[PDB]
Design a protein around this motif. Sequence first.
Motif, PDB file in Angstrom:
ATOM      1  N   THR A 193      -5.009   7.009 -11.698  1.00 47.58           N
ATOM      2  CA  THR A 193      -4.996   6.696 -10.265  1.00 47.58           C
ATOM      3  C   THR A 193      -4.081   5.489 -10.022  1.00 47.58           C
ATOM      4  OG1 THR A 193      -7.272   7.517 -10.026  1.00 47.58           O
ATOM      5  CG2 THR A 193      -6.507   6.005  -8.320  1.00 47.58           C
ATOM      6  N   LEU A 194      -3.233   5.537  -8.973  1.00 50.21           N
ATOM      7  CA  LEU A 194      -2.383   4.403  -8.598  1.00 50.21           C
ATOM      8  C   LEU A 194      -3.251   3.408  -7.811  1.00 50.21           C
ATOM      9  CD1 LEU A 194       0.522   3.199  -8.407  1.00 50.21           C
ATOM     10  CD2 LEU A 194       0.827   4.468  -6.281  1.00 50.21           C
ATOM     11  N   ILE A 195      -3.546   2.230  -8.405  1.00 48.38           N
ATOM     12  CA  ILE A 195      -4.473   1.263  -7.790  1.00 48.38           C
ATOM     13  C   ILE A 195      -3.761   0.073  -7.134  1.00 48.38           C
ATOM     14  CG2 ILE A 195      -6.468   2.000  -9.188  1.00 48.38           C
ATOM     15  CD1 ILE A 195      -6.079  -0.684 -10.885  1.00 48.38           C
ATOM     16  N   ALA A 196      -2.462  -0.119  -7.385  1.00 52.63           N
ATOM     17  CA  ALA A 196      -1.717  -1.219  -6.756  1.00 52.63           C
ATOM     18  C   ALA A 196      -0.200  -1.009  -6.875  1.00 52.63           C
ATOM     19  CB  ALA A 196      -2.100  -2.556  -7.393  1.00 52.63           C
ATOM     20  N   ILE A 197       0.557  -1.586  -5.931  1.00 50.21           N
ATOM     21  CA  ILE A 197       2.019  -1.599  -5.958  1.00 50.21           C
ATOM     22  C   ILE A 197       2.407  -3.076  -5.743  1.00 50.21           C
ATOM     23  CG2 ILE A 197       4.176  -0.717  -4.965  1.00 50.21           C
ATOM     24  CD1 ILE A 197       2.561   1.681  -3.775  1.00 50.21           C
ATOM     25  N   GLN A 198       3.175  -3.661  -6.674  1.00 50.19           N
ATOM     26  CA  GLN A 198       3.557  -5.076  -6.615  1.00 50.19           C
ATOM     27  C   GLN A 198       5.077  -5.220  -6.549  1.00 50.19           C
ATOM     28  OE1 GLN A 198      -0.207  -6.105  -9.546  1.00 50.19           O
ATOM     29  NE2 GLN A 198       1.798  -6.884 -10.197  1.00 50.19           N
ATOM     30  N   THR A 199       5.589  -6.210  -5.788  1.00 49.97           N
ATOM     31  CA  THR A 199       7.028  -6.509  -5.764  1.00 49.97           C
ATOM     32  C   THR A 199       7.289  -7.940  -6.216  1.00 49.97           C
ATOM     33  OG1 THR A 199       7.201  -7.342  -3.499  1.00 49.97           O
ATOM     34  CG2 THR A 199       7.293  -4.934  -3.781  1.00 49.97           C
ATOM     35  N   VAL A 200       8.413  -8.154  -6.902  1.00 51.50           N
ATOM     36  CA  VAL A 200       8.887  -9.494  -7.289  1.00 51.50           C
ATOM     37  C   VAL A 200      10.398  -9.526  -7.012  1.00 51.50           C
ATOM     38  CG1 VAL A 200       9.183 -11.185  -9.167  1.00 51.50           C
ATOM     39  CG2 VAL A 200       7.051  -9.866  -9.007  1.00 51.50           C
TER      40      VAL A 200
ATOM     41  N   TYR B 282       0.840  -1.211   0.000  1.00 55.89           N
ATOM     42  CA  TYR B 282       0.000   0.000   0.000  1.00 55.89           C
ATOM     43  C   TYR B 282       0.882   1.272   0.000  1.00 55.89           C
ATOM     44  CZ  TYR B 282      -4.748   1.761   0.174  1.00 55.89           C
ATOM     45  OH  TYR B 282      -5.958   2.326  -0.156  1.00 55.89           O
ATOM     46  N   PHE B 283       2.096   1.186   0.588  1.00 55.11           N
ATOM     47  CA  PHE B 283       3.051   2.292   0.681  1.00 55.11           C
ATOM     48  C   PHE B 283       4.369   1.879   0.045  1.00 55.11           C
ATOM     49  CE2 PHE B 283       0.196   2.335   4.328  1.00 55.11           C
ATOM     50  CZ  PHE B 283      -0.284   3.620   4.329  1.00 55.11           C
ATOM     51  N   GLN B 284       5.055   2.828  -0.588  1.00 55.80           N
ATOM     52  CA  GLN B 284       6.375   2.577  -1.179  1.00 55.80           C
ATOM     53  C   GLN B 284       7.073   3.918  -1.330  1.00 55.80           C
ATOM     54  OE1 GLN B 284       8.349   2.976  -4.349  1.00 55.80           O
ATOM     55  NE2 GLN B 284       9.766   2.085  -2.835  1.00 55.80           N
ATOM     56  N   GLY B 285       8.019   4.194  -0.444  1.00 58.38           N
ATOM     57  CA  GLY B 285       8.647   5.506  -0.377  1.00 58.38           C
ATOM     58  C   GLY B 285       7.579   6.529  -0.029  1.00 58.38           C
TER      59      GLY B 285
ATOM     60  N   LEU C 202       5.012   7.135  -2.223  1.00 57.44           N
ATOM     61  CA  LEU C 202       3.822   6.775  -3.001  1.00 57.44           C
ATOM     62  C   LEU C 202       2.830   6.010  -2.107  1.00 57.44           C
ATOM     63  CD1 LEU C 202       5.667   5.613  -6.243  1.00 57.44           C
ATOM     64  CD2 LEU C 202       4.204   7.599  -6.090  1.00 57.44           C
ATOM     65  N   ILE C 203       1.521   6.250  -2.316  1.00 57.72           N
ATOM     66  CA  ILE C 203       0.434   5.609  -1.566  1.00 57.72           C
ATOM     67  C   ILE C 203      -0.639   5.158  -2.559  1.00 57.72           C
ATOM     68  CG2 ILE C 203      -1.239   5.883   0.379  1.00 57.72           C
ATOM     69  CD1 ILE C 203       0.428   8.165   1.422  1.00 57.72           C
ATOM     70  N   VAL C 204      -1.122   3.907  -2.433  1.00 58.95           N
ATOM     71  CA  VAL C 204      -2.241   3.429  -3.262  1.00 58.95           C
ATOM     72  C   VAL C 204      -3.449   4.389  -3.093  1.00 58.95           C
ATOM     73  CG1 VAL C 204      -4.000   1.571  -3.507  1.00 58.95           C
ATOM     74  CG2 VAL C 204      -1.545   0.983  -3.451  1.00 58.95           C
ATOM     75  N   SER C 205      -4.137   4.678  -4.228  1.00 61.03           N
ATOM     76  CA  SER C 205      -5.269   5.603  -4.375  1.00 61.03           C
ATOM     77  C   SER C 205      -4.837   7.076  -4.736  1.00 61.03           C
ATOM     78  CB  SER C 205      -6.215   5.568  -3.166  1.00 61.03           C
ATOM     79  OG  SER C 205      -5.825   6.460  -2.136  1.00 61.03           O
ATOM     80  N   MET C 206      -3.536   7.393  -4.744  1.00 62.07           N
ATOM     81  CA  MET C 206      -3.110   8.750  -5.117  1.00 62.07           C
ATOM     82  C   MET C 206      -3.348   9.001  -6.614  1.00 62.07           C
ATOM     83  SD  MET C 206       1.013   8.382  -5.131  1.00 62.07           S
ATOM     84  CE  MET C 206       1.346  10.092  -5.481  1.00 62.07           C
ATOM     85  N   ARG C 207      -3.503  10.268  -6.980  1.00 62.42           N
ATOM     86  CA  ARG C 207      -3.686  10.685  -8.362  1.00 62.42           C
ATOM     87  C   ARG C 207      -2.265  10.856  -8.941  1.00 62.42           C
ATOM     88  NH1 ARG C 207      -7.573  10.322 -11.653  1.00 62.42           N
ATOM     89  NH2 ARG C 207      -7.274  12.446 -12.471  1.00 62.42           N
ATOM     90  N   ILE C 208      -2.034  10.394 -10.163  1.00 65.26           N
ATOM     91  CA  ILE C 208      -0.679  10.311 -10.727  1.00 65.26           C
ATOM     92  C   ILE C 208      -0.722  10.501 -12.275  1.00 65.26           C
ATOM     93  CG2 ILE C 208      -0.683   7.773 -11.238  1.00 65.26           C
ATOM     94  CD1 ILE C 208       1.915   9.332  -8.948  1.00 65.26           C
ATOM     95  N   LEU C 209       0.462  10.743 -12.908  1.00 70.05           N
ATOM     96  CA  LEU C 209       0.611  10.722 -14.361  1.00 70.05           C
ATOM     97  C   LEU C 209       1.294   9.397 -14.746  1.00 70.05           C
ATOM     98  CD1 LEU C 209       1.904  14.326 -15.108  1.00 70.05           C
ATOM     99  CD2 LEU C 209      -0.399  13.475 -15.411  1.00 70.05           C
ATOM    100  N   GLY C 210       0.828   8.789 -15.834  1.00 70.72           N
ATOM    101  CA  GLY C 210       1.373   7.536 -16.354  1.00 70.72           C
ATOM    102  C   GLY C 210       1.706   7.620 -17.830  1.00 70.72           C
ATOM    103  N   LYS C 211       2.751   6.912 -18.257  1.00 69.10           N
ATOM    104  CA  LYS C 211       3.161   6.886 -19.661  1.00 69.10           C
ATOM    105  C   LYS C 211       2.343   5.837 -20.426  1.00 69.10           C
ATOM    106  CE  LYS C 211       7.283   6.636 -22.535  1.00 69.10           C
ATOM    107  NZ  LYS C 211       8.713   6.238 -22.622  1.00 69.10           N
TER     108      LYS C 211
END
Length: 211
Positions: free
Chosen positions: A28-35, A4-7, A9-18
């Motif tokens: 909108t940032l809807i998920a953060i995944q790690t591998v 839900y948090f990464q540095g 960044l927080i899930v649900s924040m408004r953002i620009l995407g390429k």
Amino acid sequence: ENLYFQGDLIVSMRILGKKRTKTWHKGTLIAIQTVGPGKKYKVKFDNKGKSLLSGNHIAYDYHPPADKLYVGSRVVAKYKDGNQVWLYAGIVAETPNVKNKLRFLIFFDDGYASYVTQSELYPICRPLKKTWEDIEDISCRDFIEEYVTAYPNRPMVLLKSGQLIKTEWEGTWWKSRVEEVDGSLVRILFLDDKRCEWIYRGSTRLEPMFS
Ligand SMILES: COC(=O)c1cccc(NS(C)(=O)=O)c1
Ligand SMILES: [Cl-]
Ligand SMILES: [Cl-]
Ligand SMILES: [Cl-]
Ligand SMILES: [Cl-]
């Protein structure tokens, strides 16, 4: 893992995407995944589908204060294409000072260059260590690496309005004329086609810099 948090960044924040078109849009940032050591960011665009993007392909939806921007900073900036305007990725080449009338010089990923204000810039969230390494075009990437690492040592050609020179376009030399100079940029008129382009005065597309 799903985060839900990464540095900052927080899930649900408004953002620009390429997007795949290489232009940047609101979402909108809807998920953060790690591998393992890698991280991905799922964005839902306002008038589009969803993309799972790397951290260098998302940007904050606010203008950065000047103390956070350096030569070599990775940004998204307002880009003029005919009578339309887009948000396109680039590298900061100059920060505000007296000789550039307090503007930022941007070197875009596709080789174009322009002066913009602080209100026309957005910072990319997780840039690469060597910020230029995600520029797809090889000739652009190598020129920007040499520029950023050699700065403040900047070879440039001194040009005046009316001066005749040769300028590169699609692999060959064309007869051209200096129409106007604005700080580190020059407006070049291609004499056969009678159309203009703003070019950086240290570009190898200008024959005096090529030799
Ligand atoms: C396609 O662009 C290039 O090959 C290229 C090479 C060198 C310079 C540039 N532009 S700049 C950074 O000088 O504003 C573009
Ligand atoms: Cl594909
Ligand atoms: Cl894991
Ligand atoms: Cl990506
Ligand atoms: Cl990195």
